[PDB]
Design a binder for this molecule. Structure first.
Ligand SMILES: CC(C)(c1ccc(O)cc1)c1ccc(O)c(F)c1
Ligand SMILES: CC(C)(c1ccc(O)cc1)c1ccc(O)c(F)c1
Lengths: 227, 227
């Protein structure tokens, strides 16, 4: 009854906010916004890798299977983060406290369609009143459910999926008794997340080939894995 | 205890098998396979539209909202069908009884990567022993959960989602007592379905622009809606 330990644990393992710090010496331009965003992503992925080791069972997989999960799920983790930070805002995406993209900046950056898809994720979660407890559980599920076609131990990854789905089911059964289907509702938000992340990955891989926007090693490695 | 009526109803509303009938006068080629497949799709979409009217609540939405759901979900419905027909096969996709694609034909048709993604859907469902009862419920859910960004009555579509998610939850709670999380497991197969269908839509829209493969009105209309 007090509530689910995995959800508690995920809460306290939630990394601290990080700043985008767009270079205040560089004139605004699409290249500046895209450099800034992929710079921020590269920093967030460091923190994401650290965070994953908090997920029960995760650090017990092979390094290869750890990497495979992260290489598949990184973009959905990143997007769920900007979605969650944006729930109190209206038509704006809080990439960071100092980097809030409105429609006008989305257009300038060539990101109007993707950001509009991400806004559709925010809109659904706003209506569902997504809680931080659910947000963290969904990030972890998104990692374990990431559909890497490279898993060595398929059964241990399906066990990690089970563990986390259970934590979601138990959280919802204790906290959200008014809706016996709230857990399933949350799971059904995942296909739009996968959809958007698939398009974001394509967008950014294209940006990388085109080579106008500098990217860092970690973000490039993730970008370069199965796409 | 006998079991869930919506699942029963979906079962009996399941359309009959249809044949691909590749033209036995046309020499085999990528254009022939792709013509045949988009021809079959066009015929299946007629039957899919008919079928949807069986789903409780569906025919009560606006024609616009009916069309919007179908325009978003058509490809995931089609793919789930070929996946389901392929579960008893090994590395082969049963587009129709007379049209079973192996790896060699996938390569010839430029479909090796997509068909390999579809095979990954089959592999997961084989391990899960997907039943016809689940397959039909998942098709219906995929329709209601299709994330059209054009819905007029958002609340009635979320009610259709609720109804069908409930039918899945009840089916699993009665039939699959050995796994209290089987319903959620099924829902978590949906992101790979959305992933694959997003890539299939892009693939085929490209095929259409390129104009080497003739397509019929219905398939073209669905192809032309938000992409
Ligand atoms: C991957 C990236 C660069 C990003 C996403 C989240 C985040 O917290 C940092 C960067 C990103 C993805 C899709 C977008 O429309 C976007 F603006 C930025
Ligand atoms: C949309 C289409 C043409 C199709 C899918 C299912 C079906 O039953 C008929 C056609 C299709 C999609 C993805 C593929 O890799 C494919 F081979 C065919």
């Amino acid at each position: 009854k007090p509530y689910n330990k995995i959800v508690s644990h995920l809460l306290v393992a939630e990394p601290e906010k990080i700043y985008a710090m767009p270079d205040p010496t560089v004139p605004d331009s699409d290249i500046k916004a895209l450099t800034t965003l992929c710079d921020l992503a590269d920093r967030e992925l460091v923190v994401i890798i650290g965070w994953a080791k908090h997920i029960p069972g995760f650090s017990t997989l092979s390094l290869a299977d750890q990497m495979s999960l992260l290489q598949s799920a990184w973009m959905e983790i990143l997007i769920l983060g900007v979605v969650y930070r944006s729930l109190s805002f209206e038509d704006e995406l809080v990439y960071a406290d100092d980097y809030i993209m409105d429609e006008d900046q989305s257009k300038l950056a060539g990101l109007l369609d993707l950001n509009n898809a991400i806004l559709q994720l925010v809109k659904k979660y706003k209506s569902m009143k997504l809680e931080k407890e659910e947000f963290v559980t969904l990030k972890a599920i998104a990692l374990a459910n990431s559909d890497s076609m490279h898993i060595e131990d398929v059964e241990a990854v399906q066990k990690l999926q089970d563990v986390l789905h259970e934590a979601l089911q138990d959280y919802e059964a204790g906290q959200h008794m008014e809706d016996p289907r709230r857990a399933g509702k949350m799971l059904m938000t995942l296909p739009l997340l996968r959809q958007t992340s698939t398009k974001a990955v394509q967008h950014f891989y294209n940006i990388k080939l085109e080579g106008k926007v500098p990217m860092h090693k970690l973000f490039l490695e993730m970008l370069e894995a199965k796409v």
